[PDB]
Amino acid sequence: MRYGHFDDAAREYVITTPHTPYPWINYLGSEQFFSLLSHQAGGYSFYRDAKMRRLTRYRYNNIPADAGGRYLYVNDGGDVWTPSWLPVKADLDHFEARHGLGYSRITGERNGLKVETLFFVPLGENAEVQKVTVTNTSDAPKTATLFSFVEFCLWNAQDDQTNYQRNLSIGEVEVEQDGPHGSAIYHKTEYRERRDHYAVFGVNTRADGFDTDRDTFVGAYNSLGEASVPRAGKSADSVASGWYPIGSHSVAVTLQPGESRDLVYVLGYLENPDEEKWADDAHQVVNKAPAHALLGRFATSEQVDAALEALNSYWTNLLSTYSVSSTDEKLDRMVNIWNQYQCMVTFNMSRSASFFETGIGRGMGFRDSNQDLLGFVHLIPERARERIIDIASTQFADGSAYHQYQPLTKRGNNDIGSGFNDDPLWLIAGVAAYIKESGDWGILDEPVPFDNEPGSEVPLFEHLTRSFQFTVQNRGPHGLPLIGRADWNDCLNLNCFSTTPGESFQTTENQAGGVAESVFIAAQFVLYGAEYATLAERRGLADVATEARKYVDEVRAAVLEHGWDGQWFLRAYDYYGNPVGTDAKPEGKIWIEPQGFAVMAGIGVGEGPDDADAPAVKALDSVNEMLGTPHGLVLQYPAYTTYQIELGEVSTYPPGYKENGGIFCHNNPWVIIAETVVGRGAQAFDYYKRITPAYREDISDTHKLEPYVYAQMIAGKEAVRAGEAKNSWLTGTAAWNFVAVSQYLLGVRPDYDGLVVDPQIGPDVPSYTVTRVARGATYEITVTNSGAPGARASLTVDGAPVDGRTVPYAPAGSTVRVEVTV
Amino acid sequence: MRYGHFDDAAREYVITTPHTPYPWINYLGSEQFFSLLSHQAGGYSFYRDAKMRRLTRYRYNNIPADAGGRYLYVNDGGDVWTPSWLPVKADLDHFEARHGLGYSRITGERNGLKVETLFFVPLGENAEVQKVTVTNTSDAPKTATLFSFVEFCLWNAQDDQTNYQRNLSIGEVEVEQDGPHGSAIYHKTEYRERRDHYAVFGVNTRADGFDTDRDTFVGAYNSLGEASVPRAGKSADSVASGWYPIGSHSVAVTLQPGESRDLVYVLGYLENPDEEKWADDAHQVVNKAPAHALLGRFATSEQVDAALEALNSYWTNLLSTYSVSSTDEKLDRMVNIWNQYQCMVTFNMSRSASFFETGIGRGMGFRDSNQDLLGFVHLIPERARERIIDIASTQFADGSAYHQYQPLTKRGNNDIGSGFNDDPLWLIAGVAAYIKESGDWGILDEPVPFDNEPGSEVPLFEHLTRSFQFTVQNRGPHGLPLIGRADWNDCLNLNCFSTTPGESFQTTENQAGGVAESVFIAAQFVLYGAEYATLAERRGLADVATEARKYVDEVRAAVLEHGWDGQWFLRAYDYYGNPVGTDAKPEGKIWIEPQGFAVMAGIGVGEGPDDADAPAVKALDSVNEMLGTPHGLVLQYPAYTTYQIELGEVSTYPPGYKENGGIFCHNNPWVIIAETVVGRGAQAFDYYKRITPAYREDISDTHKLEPYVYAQMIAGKEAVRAGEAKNSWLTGTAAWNFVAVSQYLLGVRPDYDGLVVDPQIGPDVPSYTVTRVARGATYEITVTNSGAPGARASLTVDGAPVDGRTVPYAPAGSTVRVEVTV
Ligand SMILES: OC[C@H]1O[C@@H](O)[C@H](O)[C@@H](O)[C@@H]1O
Ligand SMILES: OC[C@H]1O[C@@H](O)[C@H](O)[C@@H](O)[C@@H]1O
Ligand SMILES: OC[C@H]1NC[C@H](O)[C@@H](O)[C@@H]1O
Ligand SMILES: OC[C@H]1NC[C@H](O)[C@@H](O)[C@@H]1O
The missing domain is CATH 1.20.890.20 (mpn423 like domain)
Incomplete structure (x- = not known):
């Protein structure tokens, strides 16, 4: 049921067994060099780009999973074991893995010898550092030989897994047994030609021996768990010539009773x-x-x-x-540590590289990296700033954009599709979130090229104009925006009609013509068009702003008029003008995306929570009855049971998985925020809990995946694996739940001209205190909360009552005490 | 050392240990469905296309190599083992693997149970059949449980190994325990949607149980050698939902001493x-x-x-x-069985799928499949006819062509580059060989589209015209052919100048301009331009033929005027117009390719073998002294020790591997043939022996790869690994060495109007008989061969002498007796 426990004071998740339901990883690094590290030391590392500068090799879908990473074979008297457990799987007297912030510690002990390894990526460095501590825990002196092991990747991860007819003949190493600080091995494949970079694997001691050739170290017919060199007790000193280069050093150790020794190993990226x-x-x-x-x-x-x-x-x-002190220590640990830590990871990785995303085809998604901003702008504003410039430079002059860009080059590509019509508006989302947070209005003036073209620079604000105008000039017959390849839901391909097997829906060519419309983009246009109009107003653009609110008005009115099914919002019109997401259809009656996003946008909001006549309220009740499960809200109901040619990828998943009836967690916080907008705090917080790691820890054997981070997908009610997650870590759920919980549930949210304090979380959190630093000042927000349905807050500030829920921004250096009653 | 032996009467290679230096494979099937089967039962199967319809999953670069395939776990009173040895690696009393023609047989025996499995793909079937015979070879009764196992792949092999974020949720199966002939499992991923196909895995009996989920069968933390289910002694009856589908049935057997039982398993592809x-x-x-x-x-x-x-x-x-009976049983087994079997494999596979080629990027190559025709035309000419049509259909109107085509769709693509200028001429090589073989002049009238465009059809001959004109209209300042992206040598990239790492020389954009020319294409053009001339004269195209011979003469003169270095032929002019492959540069002084091919074209051939002044002789003596190793002839010498930016990929290989001083065996037969052209039989035969599998069997520990098929590359004299092969099975070396030995050494070669009989093999083969069927008639050719240098045959036919070395084709049905004196 549980496989570890949080350690709040240490900011760690503590894994107390090797035998988890799946490999559970940490990310090391937060700048330009990153490592995937499982609780069994599996994974790999890359510089800037997981496809193009992958240092060490890792095998997805291996048998067993995660047999491959940074290993330390201990030979004690002929007995060989690894403190990571895998690959050797020797009985350990004690095992523990601690996953922390930018580091992990993995400890195994066997027959009087304890070996603890601290793994991290140091700030400022493109390296993974391991600090090993071997301790004699017996009453008698002891000796052992330690064999380090790392397997190199030949840099291009796609080449490495497919192009052996070339690459088996190009691996090259150097050996340096007598370096200035210890022994080192250089991996230097293709440095002969166009590469200006090599890898290093070294230790702070003169190693007894070394090995650079995988086959010599492991031996023929052997797995990692049977490697010949450690069993033999002595390095072969192999010098690779092609095949499979590795880094390994042997170090002999001697320890008196109770005595320990540190060894420091370093994997580095050098240019x-x-x-x-x-x-x-x-x-x-x-x-x-x-x-x-x-x-x-x-x-x-x-x-x-x-x-x-x-x-x-x-x-x-x-x-x-951003911090909270509350009566709910699960809420607290999520807000103060885990959800912000995950937001840092997604900012850096987008959806590129995890134990599910292979770090090959996906780089930095336009929509995804824009949405990650929402959860990240409060952490390091200046890096959010630059990310906005990089993303916006992959936009085209017409307002549409490359759907993703390659991390090493910052250049857009079409490798996972083009022409997704939701993409342009997300750029406004990220910029609005950034300006609300930082107040840096001058970013709107930053010159930004279109598709990296020298000489095409216009101000960042003009780019937002191109996004906004893209939607206005790409509406169909009902005044709703044309969907193109797909909207936020990549599997809704209404211009596809594919009958050819094995060509990606994402990438396959779309049909010209038709009238396919997205109710989702319409709700998105209403939300973010209003934000754009506001940006325009600030810039003194009254002509532009006015016209803009008009379009927002026309689209809002199109949603009520032509996008309302009776008890919920419509999803789409297909190529031929047929409604999608209507009670008139047998399957796919209601889809969640427009419900949350429409209501987030203020569409169909009535007199209050108990205004039973209001579309927003009917929509959310339907979401509740038809989509709700103990694990979260499924994307649509019922799932499709046969292929629907006109909807593209969606009906190709078996029922209950991914976009066909899966809980796609990224879109639940939309419903969360919708419910707070409507005044149903209690229900909003309920939904928050159902998908949040700290609340699902007690069902670890069901979630399966890391119990400390959000996952993309939890199997929905129609799946035999209901409750089982896939695709952990790399999900917009992290940025979107941070928004939800921090800004709409706890209620503290930066606006243009002040800090909004608008709790709406219901009776299960009756008091809390939020500490928020905003524009240089510190807000201490003490909340006493009845949880009454529909009840909203009154504020007194620094001993005096104020009107409404917006505290104008105090000067830098201030501490402001805001007293909150709901 | 050796690890087995040829069995000529059975037409098998007999492997007597699991412990070979590398996995040794056979190919099953010759039609539309194929299996890669190693001597440990490792590998996979596909229908038509290794990338797009791969039935079963194989891991390249697994640790250890080749742990995954068709396994049969035997649980005998709790002891678990596999007759394939891998993956369990339990000690076997006897082991044997026999690779035969379209079948293999693997036998393993332990503790009184012998398990023999016969693998093949039957004629007219899309299926791999296993016949398993279990024999009690003990003196007491036995009870054992047999668990079969195969791991499915999700069809698209690229998606399978990279797109887990989707594909882990799409795997589906059906289980039929009580089918009409026994139990079956259906793997039907994506059948719900666009696929009209599914795989079956069945046994001819009602199984005790089954398994379809890999994780349940194998167990958490376990590799395939430690599978839980067989260890438990009973199937878990697991039903997969996503993750990793497998096919597995359990069958209990009870056997009295000396008794055996047969079981038939079938892995089928259905539509x-x-x-x-x-x-x-x-x-x-x-x-x-x-x-x-x-x-x-x-x-x-x-x-x-x-x-x-x-x-x-x-x-x-x-x-x-085609067969030969001689005094050399090594020669004979190559000519009678192995090299012809290999030629069928290359005709089918091109270069897409082997234990080195990954069945992903590579489909059917234009140059590759054209050259394979040279060794396949005599086997099944009607299939070569169709193949010529499929190839020519991927040709563009300007005569240039797609560099390869997708086996499944027959449509060309640029996935491994475009604008290789040697490509177009190989079309003529293929058609010329085919017509000489079959006399099917009517093929030249076949209507054939460009780039598969319906309505674009012209006669095949017209395609050949376009090929010929392409070269005429693409010559440089010396009148030698413009090189384009590369010629036959993929790594001689003169229009490239790449400094960006990680980007393929094969696909990366090239510079317009410069003056880069190839001596290879010049030689190629002289050789096949001449065949083109001949075909135009015979189509009745007098002026065209005359014009064609004029062009050939210019290019021949240009080779001698500008492509001659003094002691060898030049390789090329670079982008700047500087010579490549000259004695004036310190590295890459002499390149093998234009030496073999210019001399085959008859350029610089003198008065005889002893005329030291003929450029052909000087060229070939330089090739002997500079390129000769006891393992064959290296491509150029010296190899490049620093990256040469003007030359492309070539210098990116460490010295002695692949195209940078590797023995690229494909170009060795060109020198073999060349030598016979100048009348140096002994040396030509020497070169043939150096690279030929039957002669290298006695150095199996050095060669490492299959001792019964040719490999693409043998490490060169400048390699640390000198003499170790990579990339076995799929190589043009098969077809070119067949051509060399059957046609130039042994000397029996079809021409347009008769069968040429022109032995040139030297004194190690003093007497031999060739039985050749050509145009429905059988030629019994009896050769007394002095082997004396430059000595050339005279013939008698049916008791009467004839002039020169061409025997006019006798009519179908006859037996012609040719007595040959050299
Ligand atoms: O694309 C196929 C080509 O790849 C190059 O990298 C290799 O060196 C060549 O041997 C091969 O022909
Ligand atoms: O290209 C990325 C897209 O791949 C599809 O196969 C998945 O269903 C989507 O969830 C994903 O967003
Ligand atoms: O289709 C829904 C969802 N799939 C997952 C992708 O990463 C995200 O970009 C997309 O919005
Ligand atoms: O580069 C030489 C050689 N490499 C291997 C390829 O399969 C072939 O087409 C090419 O001619």
């Missing part, structure tokens, strides 16, 4: 200017200057400790912007 | 008409009729035995066209 690639005039020997420097920065324990403390200080400081 | 996909109106249950009909065609051992006998008769028939 040289072209001028300085080589150490020799013949150009055969890599220039090792930067690696000697890197290894010198991690030559001692003290230096590792000092970096782990700077990393802890960096996390303390990131988490100082 | 239904769209109107007939579903058993039920609700469209939920697959229509099983064709799967029931398939299982019924293999419900008995008798039915298997008959099919295997028909497969034998089919091969005996294929091999009845």
Whole structure:
């Protein structure tokens, strides 16, 4: 039922068994170098780009899962074991993995020898550091040999897995047994030609021996768990020539009773200017200057400790912007630690690389990285700022955009499709969230190219004009926006009609013509068009702003007139003008996306929570009856049981999975916020709980996946695996639940001209205090909360009552005490 | 060392240990459905296309190599083992694997139970059949449980290994324990949607139980060697929902001493008409009729035995066209069995799918499948006719062509680049060989589209015109052919200048302009331009033929005037117009390709073998001294030790591998042929022996790969791994060495109007007889061969002498007796 427990004071999740339901990972690094690290040391690392600069190899869908990562074989008297458990799977007297913020510790103990490894990526460094502590826990002296192991990737991860006819002949290493700080191995494939970068794997000691060739170290016919070298007790000292390069060092250790030793291993990513690639005039020997420097920065324990403390200080400081103290310690741990930590990861990774996303085809999604901003702008505004410029530079002059860009190059590509008509409006979403947060109006003036074209620069604001005008000029017969390839739901392809197997719905060519419309984009246009009009007003553009609110008006009125089914919002009109998401159809009656997003947009809001005549209220009640489950809200009901050619990808999933009846968690917080907008705090918070890691920890054997982060997808009611998650970690659910909980449930949300304090969470959290730093000042917000249905807040500020729920921004350096009664 | 032996009478290679240096595979099937089967039962199967219809999953670069395939776990009173040895690796009393023609047989014995499995793909079937015979070889009764196992792939092999974020939720199966002939499992992923196909895995008996979920069968934390289910002794009857579908049946047997039992397993690929996909109106249950009909065609051992006998008769028939009886049993087994079998494999596979080619990026290559025709035309000429039509249909109107086509759709693509200028001329090579073989002049009238455009058809001959004109109208400043992206050598990229890492030289954009020319294409053009001339004269195209010979003469003169270095032929002019492959540069002084091919074209051939002044002789002596290793001839010398930006991919390989000083065996037969042209039989035969599998069997530990088929590359003298092969099976070396030995060494080659008999093999083959069927007549050719340098045959035919070396074709039905004196 549980496989570990949170450690709130340490900011760690503690895994107390190797035998979890699935591999459970951490991400190390927050800047430009990243590692996937499972609780069994499986995973890999990459610089900037998981497809293009992957340092170490990892196999998806391996048998068993996650047999492959950073291993340390201990040979004690002929007995070989690994403290990560896998691959050898020797009985351990004690095992524990601690996943922390930017680091993890994995401990195994066997027959009087305890081996603990601290893994992290140091701030400022493109390296993964491991600090090993071997301890004699027996009453007698003890000796052992330790064999380190890492398997290299040949940089291009797609090439590495497919192009052996070339790549088995190109692997190249160097060995440096007597370096300045210890022993090192260089992985230097293709440095001969166009690469200016190599990898290093070294230790802060003169190793007894080494191995660079996988086949020699593992042995023929053997798995990682039977590697010949550790069993033999002595390195072969292999020098790779093609095949499969690895990094491994042997170190002999001797320990008195109770005595320990630290060893420091470093996996690094090094570059040289072209001028300085080589150490020799013949150009055969890599220039090792930067690696000697890197290894010198991690030559001692003290230096590792000092970096782990700077990393802890960096996390303390990131988490100082938004905190809560409440009566619900699960709510608290989510808000203060886990949900913000995940937001940092998604900002960096988008949907690119996890234990489910393979870090090949997906780079940095236009819609996804825009939505990640919403959860990230409060953490490091300046990096959010630059991300906005990078994303907007992949937009086209007509307002549409590349659906994603390649992280190394910042260039758009069509590798997972083009012409998704929801994409343009998300850019407004992210900019609005950024300006509300930081107040940096001058970003609107930043010159930004179209599709990276030298000389095409216009102000960022003009880019938002192109997004807005894209929708206004791409409406169909009902005044709703044309959907194109798909909207937010990638599997709703109304211009597709595909009969050909094995061509991606995402990528396959679309039919010209038709009248296919999205009720979802309409709700999105209403929400974010209003935001754009506001941006325009601030810029003194009264002509532009006026026209804009008119269009918003026309589209709102189109949603009530032509997008309302009777008890919920319509989903779409197909190519031929048929309604999708109507009670008139047998399957796919109600789809969740327009319900939450329409009501978020104020569409169909009546007199209050108990205004039973109001579309918003009918919509949400229907969401509740027809879509709700103990695990969250399923995307549509009922799921499709046969292929519907005119809807594209959606009906191709078996019922209850992904977009065909799955709980697609990213869209539940839309419903959450909808319910707070309508004044049903209690129900809003209920939905929050159903999908939130801290609340699902007690059902770990059912969720299966990491119990400390949101997943993309939980199997829905119509699936035999109801409650089982897939695709953990990399989901917009993280940014969107942070919004929901922080800004609409706890109620604290930056606006243009003040801080909105508008609790709506219902009776299960009767008091809390939020600490929010906003525009240089600190708001202490003490909330006493009846939870009464429909009841909203009154504020007194610094001893004096104020009107409404917006506290105008105090000057930098202030502390403002706001007293809240709901 | 050796790890087995040839069995000529059985036409098998006999592997006597599991512990080979590398997995050794056979190919099953010769029609539309194929299996890669290793001596450990490893590999996978596909229908028509390895990328788009892969039935079963295989992991390239697994640890260990080749742990996944068709396994049969035996649980004998709790002991679990596999007769394939992998994956359980339990100690076997006896092991043997026999690779034969379209079948293999693998036998494993442990603790009084012998388990023999016969694998093949039957004629006219899309299925892999296994016949399993279990024998009690002990002196006491036995009870054992047999668990079969295969792991499905989700059809699209690329999506399977990269698109988990979708595909983990789409896997579906149906289980039929009580079918008409036994138990069956249906793998039907995506049948719900666009696929009209599904796989079956069945046994000819009612199974005790089954399994369809991989995780349940294998167990958490377990590899395939530690599978839980067989260890537990009973199936878990698991029914997959997503994740990893498998096919598995359990069958308990009880055997008295010396008793045996047969079991027939079938892995079938089935299709239904769209109107007939579903058993039920609700469209939920697959229509099983064709799967029931398939299982019924293999419900008995008798039915298997008959099919295997028909497969034998089919091969005996294929091999009845060319054979030799000589004093060299190594030569004979290559000419009679192995090289012809290989030629059928290359005709079918091109270069897409092997244990090195991943069946992903590569489909059927234009140059590749054209050149394969040279060694396949005599086997099944009607299939070569169709193949020529399929190829020519991927050609553009300007005469240039798509570099390869998708096996499933027959439509060309640029996935591995475009604008390889040697491509167009290979079309003529293929048609010339085919017509010489068959005399089917009518093929030149076949209407053939460009780029498959309906309505674009012109006669085949007209395609050849376009090929010929392409080269005429693409010459540089020396009158030598413009190189384009590359010629035959994919890595000689003169229009490239890439400094961006990670980007394929094959697909990356090229510079317009410069003056880069290829001596190889020049030689190629002289050789095949001449055939083109001949075909135009015979179509009655006098002026065209005259014009064609004029062009050939210019290009021949240009080779001698501008493509000559002094002691060898030049390789090329670079973008700047500088010579490539000259003694004036320090690396890449001499390249093999234009040496073999210019001399085959007759360029610089003098008065005889002893004329030291003929450029052909000098060229070939330079190739001997500079390129010769005891493992074959390296591509160029010295190999490049630094990246040469003007040359492309070539210098990106470490010295001695692939195109940078590897023995690229495909170009070795060109030198073999060349040598026979100058009358140096002994040396030509020497070169043939150096790379030929039967002669390298005695160095199996050095070669490492299959000792019965040619490999693409043998590491060169500048490699640390000198003599170790990579990329076995799929190589043009098969067809080119067949051409060399059958036609130039042994000397029996079809021409347009008679059969040329021109032995040039030197004194190691003093006497031999060739039985050649050509144009429905059998030629019995008896050769007394002095092997004396430059000595050339004279003939008598049916007791009467004739002039020169061409025997006019006798009419169908006759036996012609040719007595040959050299
Ligand atoms: O695309 C196929 C080509 O790839 C190159 O990288 C290899 O060196 C060539 O041997 C091969 O012909
Ligand atoms: O290309 C990415 C898209 O792939 C589809 O196969 C999935 O159903 C979507 O969830 C995903 O957004
Ligand atoms: O289709 C829904 C959803 N699939 C998952 C994708 O990452 C996201 O971009 C998309 O909005
Ligand atoms: O580059 C030489 C050679 N490499 C291997 C390819 O399959 C072939 O088409 C090419 O000619």
